[PDB]
Amino acid sequence: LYVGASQSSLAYLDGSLPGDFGFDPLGLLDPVNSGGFIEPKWLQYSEVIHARWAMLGAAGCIAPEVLGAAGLIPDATNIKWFESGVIPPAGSYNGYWADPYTIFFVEIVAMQFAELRRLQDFRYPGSMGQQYFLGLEAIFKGSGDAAYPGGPFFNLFNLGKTEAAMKELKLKEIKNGRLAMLAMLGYGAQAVMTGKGPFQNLVEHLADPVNNNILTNFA
Amino acid sequence: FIGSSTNLIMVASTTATLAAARFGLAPTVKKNTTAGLKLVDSKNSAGVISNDPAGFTIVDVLAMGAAGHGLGVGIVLGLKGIGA
Amino acid sequence: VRPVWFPGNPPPAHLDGSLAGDYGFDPLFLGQEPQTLKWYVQAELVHGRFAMLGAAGIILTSIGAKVGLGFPEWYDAGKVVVEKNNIDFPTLMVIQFYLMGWAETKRWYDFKNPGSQADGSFLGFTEEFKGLENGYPGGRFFDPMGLSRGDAAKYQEYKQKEVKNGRLAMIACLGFAAQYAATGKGPLDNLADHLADPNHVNFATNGVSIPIA
Amino acid sequence: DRKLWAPGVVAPEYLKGDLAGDYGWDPLGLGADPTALKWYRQSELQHARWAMLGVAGVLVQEIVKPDVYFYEAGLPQNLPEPFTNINMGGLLAWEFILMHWVEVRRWQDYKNFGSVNEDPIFKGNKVPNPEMGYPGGIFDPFGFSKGNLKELQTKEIKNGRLAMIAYMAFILQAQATGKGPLAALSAHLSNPFGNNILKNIGTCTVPHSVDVQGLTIPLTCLWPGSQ
């Protein structure tokens, strides 16, 4: 399908997994003599995790700038993503309730529970629905698939009632995630080149596409 | 820069390489030269598929692009070096 | 089935939930060998029970210092007692090693030979030094109220509370040392500062715990 | 079967429609354990009845005395005579003693249903207590239970759930605006676009602390807003 397809890839890329457009030029999903992290299960799961974080990031990095322009948020906020405090050298916001290292500790303890509990379900399917976790273990039974746990909370509105409908939604999740992962690379590449915001970059490219593009930015 | 000597040289160089491979005037991913400097059927392993009539895969473009870039760079800097 | 330290990870084989506070935590398999596990059981109980007395001693004397009752900080008490009371440090230390030495050596040989300290060799005392279980020397001297010899289920529950409260106190004493080293103040001075400003007065802003902060 | 919280959602197996106000809604699965569901239902009844009294208190007081701010009525200087500047400690003494009795009585009914359904003093005085959380008798002095109790239990839980949301609106609106719930409506109606959460949010109008008869009680808003 997509450019780069190879007879070699057609061996394992039979179109069962979401977003199988036949593109594995380096043969990473080949199940033969697979091991470590270079194996189908881990690599498909990692594409979805990267994709979901990238979809939230592509929106989070472009939201404040747009809303600030619309006047829906105070200018105090409306800061550039790289200037939020993730990279102090590039800038940092001093208006948070606490300092970044204090909030970062809160992040560590929160993520460790979220990540290590997500990991345990990939390692021991169904394990997070057994030991007591304040009654929440009822919603962490998961399914046989790590990337698609579903259940009372992760699939609150029970969307994807049929196998076909769920398959389509899984295709749309991977498509939007792959696009957002590419946008997040763009945001970083365009922040190093112009030192401006992604929204600003778009506004300039519309104000004058010729004098406002990568070839002009080089100078 | 557009239409400048450097730009024209670079465009022509890369274009010439792509064209040479596209028309069997150069080695390709499916055409390899013999010790006698010939051009026979190669056996690519990955075997990228190409709808192109001459089976010009993306790898062929990448190769020609590099070759042409190198050629253009050498010619441009070389002319600058020889004053021309 | 039994709650474990890392949910989802099977408990080690040498840990069968029989011991109090068994949450299958032995990542370096240090208690894999049984006899070694029995020794470490008494070790954790002895460390834990001292930590519980320590923590309760620091917390009370720290409260008395927080209020105006003239109780020295834990890290200054040793010098105050010796100075104010003109007590000879060497004498006190040697007396301690004499008393602890006697009690520890008798507990040691009970571990090596269970029940061997109930022969009457010590002033004719027999039953008060036989020992009920490893790390649990009941009798009428150590369990004067009989809580271990009445209601087996209550005894098991009390053992669970003892080990958990001892592990908490052991963590708290490591906290009292780390906080004093990092802040130079007392424990209840640290709690007042945090309570006053919990978002701006914590370890992340102490200038020591996170060097890049 | 019955109507649910959303179109297409499948009710949890433990939610079959026995309890009133059952829309099969347990996204976090906290009712899967029967013991937990019983306690949580009592907790929900408690939060519902208290919140309905709170919504009614803030509204009635606001109409009768529009000059008194609900968020700062607890201050003794704002107490109605002859309770103005009354020793707050002595007041808490009455509340702790009385509440502790009634709360441990209700609690023992949960531990052992029908174990405390009798006057501990004047023997013979007993409440019917048809269901846990529904004592009745002296507690139902007008006999409204002798009818469609289940349908009335639905109205109670539904009005209670709505009052629990409303009360938290009053609180958050009070914190962002500094006005009670009828004053806020008036300010909105006064200039809907001018006065709304879009502008009101971002500001905590509550001090950091207040001195009550000699004691500093720390005060916080529910979000990091300008304070």
Add this chain to the structure above:
Amino acid sequence: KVKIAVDRNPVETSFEKWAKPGHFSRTLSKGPNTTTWIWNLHADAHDFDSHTSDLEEISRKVFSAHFGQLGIIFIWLSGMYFHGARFSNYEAWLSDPTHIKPSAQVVWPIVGQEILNGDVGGGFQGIQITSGFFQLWRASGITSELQLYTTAIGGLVMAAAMFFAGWFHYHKAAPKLEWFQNVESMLNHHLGGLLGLGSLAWAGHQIHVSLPVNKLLDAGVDPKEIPLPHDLLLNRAIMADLYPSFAKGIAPFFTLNWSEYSDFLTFKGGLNPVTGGLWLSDTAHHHVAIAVLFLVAGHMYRTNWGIGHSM
């Protein structure tokens, strides 16, 4: 087909063999009867070929033994950087390199050995070193013991990674013989990646850190007031003041106007009169050329496409 091929969980991670000396040999596993066994055990420890006739098993032992060596070398480097940050006179030598003698080993005062702590200068007493680390660190643009301490920690993180890699690629995911027999692929990566990328990356560090820092040092600027490497990496105006061509950015590179970068990419030759060493601008243009040459060389052998050569 060149591809990643490995066996999963090939060897168990237990201490059972640790307690059985000579387990690797059919003759030595029987245990010692004479003292010759002890010598034979150590002499035949790393002779995998003699241990087993399986090439794949031998290849897996060689690969993991190399990760062990790389980990050893990293610990050695971390120690040198650590001793430069905690037991050296580097900061004083940076200010007075023509008189202060480099020293990075201090001896404890015992049995009278403290005499070995010579008066090297800079208010320091220690053993004079001749490894040339002080001059290497100055060339790299290091001006603080903090930078030496941070590199030491990095080297230990790298040493831990090397030892992990060794355990993982032998006990968890062991590469199969076919993997190791991909000589055409190995040469392409070692020439293009290890050598060419390594040279390109080093040119990056030299152009953005080594050249400005050393230019300021040679101008007489005190090491304390020199801009930190990141300040130079995040500010073009400072680099533009030191090298005017930086004001043009990377445009000249993509426009083939390389001549503009003549102020930092040079062919002076000879020696810097201030320091007596080669010009760093010459070393920068050199490593850039090496990088290009090796990137081309790494595209000569055939792998998974028809293009390339068969050795």
Add this chain to the structure above:
Amino acid sequence: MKDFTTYLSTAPVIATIWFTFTAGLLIEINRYFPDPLVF
């Protein structure tokens, strides 16, 4: 763990530990009793 302790009981390991102990003991003695030439 038993195999690990057996490995720690191997000739070279015990020698390193025993010699480190003996060296340490002698060093500390000369650290607290420097220049000991006679009894």
